[PDB]
């Protein structure tokens, strides 16, 4: 029923890159999803105490959220775009696994994921 420590967002010994694909993931992908009217439940780690979800972290072992992704992008945490893309997909998948079809939170994730898929379809060529 307790919250775990958050996912890692800083590690000075992890090698980093600044690339046009990662720039796109922040400037287009993250920004598009973040400003959406369904973003709010996804803008920070799931607070299982606040939301009375005592079994959430019993079930979900790789938590992920856009707050974490935002910090990772803004802090240059990643080596490549696929790392970041995986974080988004983990976020959506966690939601789908924990909840039931047609749940409000699932419909919200589905709408964000539709936008996500469109932007990723348009992922720029590597410079
Ligand atoms: C990503 C996510 C969020 C929530 N609940 C929620 C609702 C409103 C505001 C904040 C939060 C964290 N979830 C509830 N069950 N799975 C969930 N997944």
From Swiss-Prot:
Transmembrane segments: none annotated. Coiled coil: none annotated. It is found in: Nucleus; Chromosome. Residues 17-123 form the Bromo domain. Ubiquitously expressed. Phosphorylation by CK2 disrupt the intramolecular binding between the bromo domain 2 and the NPS region and promotes binding between the NPS and the BID regions, leading to activate the protein and promote binding to acetylated histones. In absence of phosphorylation, BRD4 does not localize to p53/TP53 target gene promoters, phosphorylation promoting recruitment to p53/TP53 target promoters. The NET domain mediates interaction with a number of chromatin proteins involved in transcription regulation (NSD3, JMJD6, CHD4, GLTSCR1 and ATAD5). The C-terminal (CTD) region mediates interaction and recruitment of CDK9 and CCNT1 subunits of the P-TEFb complex. It is also required for maintenance of higher-order chromatin structure. Chromatin reader protein that recognizes and binds acetylated histones and plays a key role in transmission of epigenetic memory across cell divisions and transcription regulation. Remains associated with acetylated chromatin throughout the entire cell cycle and provides epigenetic memory for postmitotic G1 gene transcription by preserving acetylated chromatin status and maintaining high-order chromatin structure. During interphase, plays a key role in regulating the transcription of signal-inducible genes by associating with the P-TEFb complex and recruiting it to promoters. Belongs to the BET family. This is Bromodomain-containing protein 4. It comes from Homo sapiens (Human). The lineage of its organism: Eukaryota, Metazoa, Chordata, Craniata, Vertebrata. The chain holds residues 44 to 168 of 1362 of the full protein.
């Amino acid at each position: 029923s307790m919250n775990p420590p958050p996912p890692e967002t800083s590690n000075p010994n992890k090698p980093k890159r600044q690339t046009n694909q990662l720039q796109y993931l922040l400037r287009v992908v993250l920004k598009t999803l973040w400003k959406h009217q369904f973003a709010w439940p996804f803008q920070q780690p799931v607070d299982a105490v606040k939301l009375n979800l005592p079994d959430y972290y019993k079930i979900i072992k790789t938590p992920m959220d856009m707050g974490t992704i935002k910090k990772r992008l803004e802090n240059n945490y990643y080596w490549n775009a696929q790392e970041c893309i995986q974080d988004f997909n983990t976020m959506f998948t966690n939601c789908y696994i924990y909840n039931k079809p047609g749940d409000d939170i699932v419909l919200m994730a589905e709408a964000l994921e539709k936008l996500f898929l469109q932007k990723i379809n348009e992922l720029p060529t590597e410079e």
